[PDB]
Write a protein that binds this ligand. Structure first.
Ligand SMILES: [Ca+2]
Ligand SMILES: [Ca+2]
Length: 517
């Protein structure tokens, strides 16, 4: 019974219409062929599959370098007084970020120190809080970092948590923190809100202290049109829907306006639903690919369900001119969205290079709808993580994918190894308009790599940005927890190969499918 638009694409695909089932015909007849972008540039079903295939090929342009496992240590500053138990413990440290210049993104020099903010917590506990660390500016030793303690103090609980964001210097050399306030009092849901506070520090004989936290307030927690609200999520969640309102990255443009680029899901502008399975725009391949993808999605309940709930977004908003008490001045449509394709894209980050804006983000591909693609990544590598990336001619402008699909970095070792990494976060490099330093955390949380193997700071490595919108991983590598690249920072001892990327025993260890599935 095909209608004529469907007829059209079946023929172009080289498909014999007489081979189609009633259900296949009915599905193709529902297909909406509109070409209008409703929610920014999309990671299409085809882009995602291409990202996965690239990860599977283990292409040298994009793979995370191998790290020499034997060199890897827990960060000494991650042994510290815990925010919740008030007792000194060895903590997992994961998502971390330096205090940056709000304009250039460079690691800031604060009175001769570098400053970092980090999520830490006790392995295997629900313990999500942020801590302030310092080292001498340009110092290259993991072990020279010191932990000031939890920004929001001791006697904390799981009822009110802090998740990731960003941080910059204010005019008076106070720090403006952007973070995620999480309230779990409504039946332990992770009700996430973008929050901000001003930090006042003191410097005394090589000792940095947190003197005061001021102006702590909620900036934004979603509107309902551009970005999903908690109430919206709660109204329809029977357990298949993610909730995301986090990882706010602050950045100031040439004209002096501050923006937040952040992780969320779309709202009613272009909302999740079964209807997204029937939006042609979302597929992004040729006719054969799109149709094959439609039929695959409808024939597997897990893929159909995931596609029905997928609507990750990278959002943007403009702030007012009050440095110390930022409030939303304007909301916009997402820079990127992934309706039908993924329900999690994290740590969005913008780096200004030359006259361009590069938008990066990390994602676990097993948050995607295409089970085949991410399962195959799991079989190839033992993990499914990636950094993706896009470029625009202006901060709010239209972002276009790098390396065709958006792929930039792909997982290279199993999620349960010591040298596994996640939360790729690129930092500019002084004097270079075509390189960023890629930082990440190493060793997945909660002891999945073994007793005493805490999440720690990875060795960092350079990534080259080419003028034709491609990227190239470079073999240049630092010590663990280096935020600042210079000639002095390279350490060849950290470089691994497939063999030395594993500690003894680790090659022969089963996968942890609870973690990567
Ligand atoms: Ca969703
Ligand atoms: Ca360095």
């Amino acid at each position: 019974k095909l209608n004529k638009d469907a007829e059209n694409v079946v023929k172009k695909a080289g498909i014999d219409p007489n081979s189609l089932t009633d259900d296949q015909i009915k599905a193709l007849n529902k297909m909406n062929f509109s070409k209008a972008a409703k929610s920014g540039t999309q990671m299409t079903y085809n882009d995602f599959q291409k990202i996965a295939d690239t990860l599977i090929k283990q292409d040298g342009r994009y793979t995370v370098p191998f790290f020499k496992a034997s060199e890897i240590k827990n960060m000494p500053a991650a042994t510290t007084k815990d925010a919740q138990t008030n007792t000194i413990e060895p903590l997992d440290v994961w998502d971390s970020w330096p205090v940056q210049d709000v304009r250039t993104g460079q690691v800031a020099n604060w009175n001769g120190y570098q400053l970092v903010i980090a999520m830490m917590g006790i392995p295997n506990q629900n313990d999500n809080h942020i801590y302030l660390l310092y080292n001498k500016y340009g110092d290259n030793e993991l072990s020279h970092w010191k932990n000031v303690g939890p920004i929001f103090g001791y006697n904390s609980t799981a009822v009110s948590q802090e998740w990731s964001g960003s941080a910059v210097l204010n005019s008076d050399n106070s720090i403006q923190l952007f973070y995620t306030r999480v309230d779990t009092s409504d039946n332990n849901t992770n009700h996430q809100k973008i929050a901000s506070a001003t930090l006042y520090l003191t410097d005394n004989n090589g000792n940095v202290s947190l003197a005061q936290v001021a102006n702590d307030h909620i900036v934004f927690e979603g509107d309902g049109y551009y970005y999903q609200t908690y109430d919206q999520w709660k109204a329809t969640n029977k357990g298949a829907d993610n909730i995301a309102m986090r990882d706010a990255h602050v950045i100031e443009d040439d004209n002096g306006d501050r923006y937040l680029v952040f992780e969320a899901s779309t709202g009613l502008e272009n909302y999740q639903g079964e209807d997204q399975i029937y939006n042609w725009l979302n597929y992004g391949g040729d006719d054969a690919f799109n149709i094959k993808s439609l039929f695959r999605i409808l024939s597997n309940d897990d893929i159909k369900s995931r596609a029905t709930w997928a609507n990750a977004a990278i959002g943007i908003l403009k702030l007012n001119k009050d440095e110390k008490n930022p409030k939303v001045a304007e909301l916009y449509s997402p820079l990127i969205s992934a309706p039908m394709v993924s329900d999690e894209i994290e740590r969005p980050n913008v780096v200004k290079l030359g006259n361009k804006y590069y938008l990066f983000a990390a994602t676990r591909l097993n948050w995607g709808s295409n089970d085949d693609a991410w399962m195959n990544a799991n079989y190839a590598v033992g993990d499914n993580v990636a950094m993706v990336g896009y470029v625009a001619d202006s901060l709010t402008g239209s972002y276009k994918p790098l390396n065709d699909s958006g792929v930039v970095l792909t997982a290279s070792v199993p999620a349960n190894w010591r040298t596994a990494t996640y939360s790729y976060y690129a930092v500019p490099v002084a004097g270079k308009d075509d390189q960023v330093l890629v930082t990440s955390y190493m060793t997945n949380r909660n002891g999945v790599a073994g007793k005493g193997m805490d999440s720690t700071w990875a060795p960092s490595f350079l990534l080259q940005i080419n003028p034709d919108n491609t990227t190239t991983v470079l073999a240049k590598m630092t010590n663990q927890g280096d935020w600042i690249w210079d000639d002095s920072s390279e350490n060849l001892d950290m470089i691994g190969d497939l063999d030395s990327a594993a500690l003894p025993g680790e090659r022969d260890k089963p996968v942890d499918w609870d973690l990567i599935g």
